[PDB]
Design a protein around this ligand. Sequence first.
Ligand SMILES: [Cu+2]
Length: 228
Amino acid sequence: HGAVTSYNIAGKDYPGYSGFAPTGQDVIQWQWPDYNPVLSASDPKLRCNGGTGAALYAEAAPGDTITATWAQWTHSQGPILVWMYKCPGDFSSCDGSGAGWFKIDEAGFHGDGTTVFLDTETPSGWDIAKLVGGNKSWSSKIPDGLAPGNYLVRHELIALHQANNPQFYPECAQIKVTGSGTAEPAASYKAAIPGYCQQSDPNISFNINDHSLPQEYKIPGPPVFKGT
Ligand SMILES: [Cu+2]
């Protein structure tokens, strides 16, 4: 349970949408309803937690840092994914559809698999554990050379504490990427969302408490796009 509540982009502060009590104030973040998980990989809410858009954008150049903050976050097992999506034109006509989503950042499981397992709570072998406990942040570089334009950026945490019962927590925000890069990820780096994973994939629904499995976690979605 939790959501990205605010951002720091290229050194500037951007408040998020206030899911539990919208203020009516202009923000860069697409709407989100509350802290409940999306429970199915094929649910359209998986994309941007049912948001439709936003009035503002943050400026950023390639190589600039995107930092998202989770005012609250409770789970110590599962991956972090950060994606981007090139809007064809105006942010207002961008719904995030088709296979435009590419990963720019990811973190998964780094435990040794014999004292720290996939299901171990403390000390968790997942980078997500570092987001737990209030006002924790995650920073990602906007890939070098990225062609300029209007982009969405999507943060997604997938909690895996419950055997066979994945829990997705996503949000989208609006980034106007400046400069004169030309790099665009190839089709093999891009996915649809929902679409990049199936509910029954072995890194999505599986028995995390089963210590006889390999203690490695393949992060879902395509390889990360690095740029140049
Ligand atoms: Cu939760």
